[PDB]
Amino acid sequence: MTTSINSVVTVFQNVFTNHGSTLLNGILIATTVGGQSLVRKLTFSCPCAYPLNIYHSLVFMFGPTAALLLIGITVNSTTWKLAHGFFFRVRDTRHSWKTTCVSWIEVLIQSSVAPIAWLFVVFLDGGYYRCYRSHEFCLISDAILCKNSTILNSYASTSSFNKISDNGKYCPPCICVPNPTDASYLEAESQIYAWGLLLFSGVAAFLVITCNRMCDKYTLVQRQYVETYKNVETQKFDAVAKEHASQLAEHNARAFFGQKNPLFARLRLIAAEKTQQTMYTPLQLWNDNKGYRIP
Amino acid sequence: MTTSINSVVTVFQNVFTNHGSTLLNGILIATTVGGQSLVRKLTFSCPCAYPLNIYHSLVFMFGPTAALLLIGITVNSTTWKLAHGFFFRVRDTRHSWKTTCVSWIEVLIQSSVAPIAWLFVVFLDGGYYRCYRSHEFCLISDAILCKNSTILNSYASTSSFNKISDNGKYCPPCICVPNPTDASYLEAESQIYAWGLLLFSGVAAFLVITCNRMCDKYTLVQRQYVETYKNVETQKFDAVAKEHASQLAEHNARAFFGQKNPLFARLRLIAAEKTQQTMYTPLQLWNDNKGYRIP
Amino acid sequence: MTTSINSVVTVFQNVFTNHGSTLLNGILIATTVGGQSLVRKLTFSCPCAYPLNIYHSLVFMFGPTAALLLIGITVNSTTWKLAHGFFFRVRDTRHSWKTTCVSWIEVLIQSSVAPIAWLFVVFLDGGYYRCYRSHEFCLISDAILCKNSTILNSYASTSSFNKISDNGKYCPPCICVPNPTDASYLEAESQIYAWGLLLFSGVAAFLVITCNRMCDKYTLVQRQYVETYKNVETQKFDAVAKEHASQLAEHNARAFFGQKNPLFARLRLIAAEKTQQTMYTPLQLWNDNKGYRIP
Amino acid sequence: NPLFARLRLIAAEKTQQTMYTPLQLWNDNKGYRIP
């Protein structure tokens, strides 16, 4: 199933080079799927225990989701433009409660793209979901008794049998390997939960990013121009900041080997803005407010 | 069947580099078919259950169709030019009810190219359709009884046989693997449904895109010039918007390190227009209406 | 498990080329993981002794952590800017007690990135943690008696058996290889401790580097400009120092084959500074204080 | 450019400050604080 999902990686590399909502993290998601298909070639360590099988399945599922959710927050620039130095903002430059929640849900969804994709990848594998209800099916309270004292584990594996003892309640190696009828049943149960999660996330994400492209105040040419102007001023401003710091570092380095902007400007110079005026991306709005009235 | 359909992918790469209706998504469709032939090299997980086999077949068929239909909507530009910010259009700039349905059916067909192609690819495989009426043939109500309690599954697989028990009503492994006579019969049943769907879609699509190239008001040289002018102004306008935002970001970045267009224009600047006048693609029609009378 | 974690190395090479806190050591960490996956292909020497198994496991875990912690200190520049020549600083140029602890915790966390990653890599292997409680499970006080005199080791391996003698308290080869039920149990115990450590470190590191990006005085554009100015003056100052020493070495080399700056400046020229004034990175603050008043 | 800028942009000035020729003095007073 590795080369199949790698071909799917090439397909959605073509997708994340075509379009989407944004594309700041489309490089990393396809590399995660294309590398962790080959990880899933060597997985399901899948212990033979009552609590540790649920732990090794539940942690291994809902752990990298939280990890990639945290990475999708922290790498995403806009949340830092919301909350880089939230304590020491000069007052009334932090903007609102309603708009900051819209930006918060924006960065949450742009973050949560990648963990939903990873969850769909592993649920789409016949993997750690069989390692979950392979436990939860096996009637395992006698293996609680078997692991109260490991002498019972030894004499349940060796003296009494394992699959001949499939009558009552079971001790371990049903856990690490089930019946292949049960294994295939629960494997495709994982496949249908995988596609149900993917289709639910796709429909809900389509509906949300449509309802924030259909309730958008600006319209499609005006929105493409605001996005082009945003994407050019947050590069041209950085190029001018770099050459300004480079000249003032040139002169201050020459200043040493020849011996022998208030917070209001640096805070109106920061986005997560209102889009209610003809000017926007509040470098413009600061510039209209204070000096240098027009360019 | 993988390299065969990959050769078909190369053939229809030549086709989608020759002609068609449009070619904005012809790159991705051939990559989907050429990668998911190799996906179909490793498929039919195909569970041994009464409801889950129909679920794992029906979801796996009609799920990626809806997913690629949603992708074919959202990637396609024209529907956003219909409905990017449909709430906050300045009134009477949204145009009609009849013309917007023509554009809606246009983006629906240009979307639905790729799911019909994917449906034909998987039906053309002997795949998840055998995984559908392999269930629906097998007389499976005794497997409902077998999966009311999995002890009956165990003693139907082990104690009683599976293919020696082909007399009455069946319990699982008929489901996961049928008789090869039945399998080949139902496989080519899937092949003839595949080609029936493809030929029906091809005839209907030919008839529709002919009846919207034969009921077209403009004629073939005038239509090729309107398409060339559209395809050059929605690139030249973006180049001028980029260099305009670049100059006004240059000057506004220099404006900060030296301290120490109403909605009517941005809405008549948007397509999904009437083609009833000598001017068209309503940047021209706006320009004829308001200032800068001729170029 | 080698190529899997090498694919993870490629993924987090993409991560450490995207973003983070800093990236001065992101080259070396991925090379450590990608090379020591292939080291872990040939590991668990794992002796058959009572004290030496715990020693060979505990030293091999908590040794390279201390080694990479020491390397992460010494390679990191900022701690030397705190304490290169701490004895012979001219007095009141060493700054405070509170701020130097903030820089100390900064260099401790930037150091401790790599040992936590290495600890997670080896705990994520089924490795030297099975080589720890494979000892601690095996009831080994009879192997203390067996290694009080190695004649008992010889007659415990040869005359009496090893796995037939799994009744009471055990002598060696249980240690070097346990029961595979126990081995897989304790292996996935190591996996869940691995992910628990990784998730705890990730949540705590996110919370700390957020609480020192949310309690930051400057804000995100001002902080990016201070970081750009810092990253350009500690290169432009070095280029001017190099060409100044090159001219004064040119002239002093010509000065020999033609025969036949107090400590205050060199100490205010050093960082780990206060960020309380409009000027910062105290080359600027020195320059404002003493001569060459402005550039 | 209001009349205040076009009037502090005009000489016959005081020479009492470190800046002079009152384009400089206007520039120090109002925006564009230093060159």
Author numbering:
A (entry chain S), B (entry chain T), C (entry chain R): 1 to 260, 278 to 312
D (entry chain G): 278 to 312
Describing publication, verbatim:
Calcium homeostasis modulators (CALHMs/CLHMs) comprise a family of pore‐forming protein complexes assembling into voltage‐gated, Ca2+‐sensitive, nonselective channels. These complexes contain an ion‐conduction pore sufficiently wide to permit the passing of ATP molecules serving as neurotransmitters. C. elegans expresses only a single homolog of CALHM1, termed CeCLHM1, in its sensory neurons and muscle cells. In these cells, CeCLHM1 forms a Ca2+‐sensitive ion channel involved in regulating the function of excitable cells and maintaining normal motility of the worms.
